[PDB]
């Protein structure tokens, strides 16, 4: 019978400037490598350095997003625990250097399900764009500063809307279906004014 075996994580360590936040994903797995539903606790072992929170208040799922807030320069660890299992994830909070490059981050699964009845509902993609210094530290969230667009004229039957959603000083770019007739990839272009920063492909699926 399946038991929790691994608290899988998509980060080997968080690197963030003071005053910035960064995210990573947890996936609970059984001994066979399949998803396992269980609850999780997240704790910072030095809250004066960094604080931490977890999506869905850490209940009822096999996948969670952990958010780390850089409070003051220093190093610490995030401990993620479920039952007898734990993972300690390194955290480094730095002053932060000048911007070296950008990361286009997909917060969800990167998919929009144009089915009328999927459960759980899966009707968007959520994007952030980060500024990153030469050492790989997140030094800014520039999601509000960028413009994200798809092709002006549809050429593949996949049609999406992209809209900035801003509250309490935090911006997410939210992608939704806009009358897609087909499934497939749609290329989004990310620009800072007239400068192209990169592209990201979102996917429309249909699980009906
Ligand atoms: Ca999605
Ligand atoms: Ca749907
Ligand atoms: Ca299209």
From TrEMBL:
Annotated binding of Ca(2+) 2, by residue: 113, 115, 118, 123
Domain BIG2: 3-92, 106-186
Sites where the protein binds Ca(2+) 3: 151, 154, 156, 158, 186
Residues involved in Ca(2+) 1 binding: 108-109, 111, 122, 124
Protein name: Surface layer protein
Gene name as annotated: sbsC
């Amino acid at each position: 019978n399946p038991v929790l075996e691994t608290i899988a994580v998509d980060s080997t360590g968080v690197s963030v400037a003071k005053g910035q936040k960064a995210t990573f994903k947890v996936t609970l797995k059984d001994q066979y490598g399949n998803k396992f539903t269980g609850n999780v606790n997240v704790t910072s072992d030095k809250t004066e350095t960094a604080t931490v929170s977890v999506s869905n208040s850490g209940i009822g799922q096999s996948e969670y997003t952990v958010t780390v807030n850089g409070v003051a320069e220093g190093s610490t660890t995030i401990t993620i625990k479920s039952g007898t299992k734990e993972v300690k994830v390194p955290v480094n909070v730095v002053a932060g250097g000048p911007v070296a490059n950008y990361q286009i981050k997909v917060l969800d699964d990167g998919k929009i399900d144009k089915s009328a009845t999927e459960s759980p509902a899966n009707n968007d993609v959520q994007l952030k764009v980060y500024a990153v210094d030469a050492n790989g530290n997140i030094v800014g969230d520039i999601t509000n500063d960028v413009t994200i667009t798809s092709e002006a004229t549809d050429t593949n039957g996949v049609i999406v809307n992209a809209s900035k959603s801003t509250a309490n000083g935090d911006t997410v770019y939210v992608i939704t279906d806009n009358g897609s007739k087909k499934v497939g990839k749609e290329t989004l272009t990310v620009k800072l004014g007239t400068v192209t920063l990169g592209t990201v492909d979102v996917e429309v699926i249909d699980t009906t």
